């Protein structure tokens, strides 16, 4: 059974998703079988109350492009015990992307995929452009790292 998955704790944890990024954020919940399940998106600079649970796993992505985002400065978010009944913050931010990855984001936003190969670049960068960021590949990378 998949390593990265929420546990069925049945222990409520009040959370507030706080989008501190300029992107439209897609919160993605890993269900009890490790399958990613999307929750409604958050406009930039907005926040939202969630009823989640102890030991559930979340990650967060640009809704339009699936660029990775950070939550409390890391890849994954796990709601904890509500200490003194106070909700937990999930602060969603931009990472410091590599200059390369950031250039790829901008070129992707301007060029339709059918036309990537009509740009005057070397072979390796076409591949790079085509290899869109992807939740499923991120989970496989995280699982491998966690072994």
């Amino acid at each position: 059974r998949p390593v990265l998955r929420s546990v069925n704790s049945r222990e409520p944890s009040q959370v507030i998703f706080c989008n501190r990024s300029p992107r439209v954020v897609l919160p993605v919940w890993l269900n009890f079988d490790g399958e990613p399940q999307p929750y409604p998106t958050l406009p930039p600079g907005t926040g939202r109350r969630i009823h989640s649970y102890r030991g559930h796993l979340w990650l967060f992505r640009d809704a339009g492009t699936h660029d990775g985002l950070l939550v409390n400065q890391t890849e994954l978010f796990v709601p904890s015990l509500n200490v003194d009944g106070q909700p937990i913050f999930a602060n969603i931010t931009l990472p410091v992307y590599t200059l390369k990855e950031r250039c790829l984001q901008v070129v992707r936003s301007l060029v339709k995929p059918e036309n990537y190969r009509r740009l005057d670049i070397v072979r390796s960068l076409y591949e790079d452009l085509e290899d869109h960021p992807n939740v499923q590949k991120d989970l496989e990378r995280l699982t491998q790292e966690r072994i």
Binding site: N8, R10, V15, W29, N31, R48, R49, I50, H56
Partner: peptide, 10 residues
């Protein structure tokens, strides 16, 4: 089995 997924019930 009694699965409770997160809600936007909030």
């Amino acid at each position: 089995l009694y699965y409770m997924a997160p809600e936007h019930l909030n």
